[PDB]
Design a binder for this molecule. Sequence first.
Ligand SMILES: [Zn+2]
Ligand SMILES: [Zn+2]
Ligand SMILES: [Zn+2]
Ligand SMILES: [Zn+2]
Ligand SMILES: [Zn+2]
Ligand SMILES: [Zn+2]
Ligand SMILES: [Zn+2]
Ligand SMILES: [Zn+2]
Ligand SMILES: [Zn+2]
Ligand SMILES: [Zn+2]
Ligand SMILES: [Zn+2]
Ligand SMILES: [Zn+2]
Ligand SMILES: [Zn+2]
Ligand SMILES: [Zn+2]
Ligand SMILES: [Zn+2]
Ligand SMILES: [Zn+2]
Ligand SMILES: [Zn+2]
Ligand SMILES: [Zn+2]
Lengths: 6, 6, 6, 6, 6, 6, 6, 6, 6, 6, 6, 6, 6, 6, 6, 6, 6, 6
Amino acid sequence: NNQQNY
Amino acid sequence: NNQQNY
Amino acid sequence: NNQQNY
Amino acid sequence: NNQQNY
Amino acid sequence: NNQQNY
Amino acid sequence: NNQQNY
Amino acid sequence: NNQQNY
Amino acid sequence: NNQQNY
Amino acid sequence: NNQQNY
Amino acid sequence: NNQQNY
Amino acid sequence: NNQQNY
Amino acid sequence: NNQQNY
Amino acid sequence: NNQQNY
Amino acid sequence: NNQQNY
Amino acid sequence: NNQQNY
Amino acid sequence: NNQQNY
Amino acid sequence: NNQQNY
Amino acid sequence: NNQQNY
Ligand SMILES: [Zn+2]
Ligand SMILES: [Zn+2]
Ligand SMILES: [Zn+2]
Ligand SMILES: [Zn+2]
Ligand SMILES: [Zn+2]
Ligand SMILES: [Zn+2]
Ligand SMILES: [Zn+2]
Ligand SMILES: [Zn+2]
Ligand SMILES: [Zn+2]
Ligand SMILES: [Zn+2]
Ligand SMILES: [Zn+2]
Ligand SMILES: [Zn+2]
Ligand SMILES: [Zn+2]
Ligand SMILES: [Zn+2]
Ligand SMILES: [Zn+2]
Ligand SMILES: [Zn+2]
Ligand SMILES: [Zn+2]
Ligand SMILES: [Zn+2]
């Protein structure tokens, strides 16, 4: 699973 | 699993 | 931010 | 930030 | 920041 | 598992 | 920062 | 497991 | 900073 | 396991 | 800083 | 295990 | 700094 | 195990 | 600084 | 085991 | 500084 | 085991 917070 | 906080 | 992998 | 891998 | 690997 | 906090 | 590997 | 705090 | 390897 | 605090 | 290897 | 505090 | 190797 | 405090 | 090798 | 305090 | 080798 | 205090 992937979570990216820019 | 991956979490990246920029 | 929160990521939980059960 | 929080990442928990159970 | 917190990372816990059970 | 990977957590990166920039 | 905290990393715990059980 | 990997945690990097920049 | 804290790293614990059980 | 790896923890780097820059 | 703290590193404990059990 | 590795912990580096720069 | 503290390193304990049990 | 390795701990380096710069 | 403290290093204990049990 | 290795601990270096610069 | 303290180093104890049991 | 190695402890170096610079
Ligand atoms: Zn942003
Ligand atoms: Zn940011
Ligand atoms: Zn699962
Ligand atoms: Zn699991
Ligand atoms: Zn596990
Ligand atoms: Zn930042
Ligand atoms: Zn384990
Ligand atoms: Zn920073
Ligand atoms: Zn273990
Ligand atoms: Zn820094
Ligand atoms: Zn052990
Ligand atoms: Zn520093
Ligand atoms: Zn032992
Ligand atoms: Zn320094
Ligand atoms: Zn021993
Ligand atoms: Zn110094
Ligand atoms: Zn002995
Ligand atoms: Zn000195």
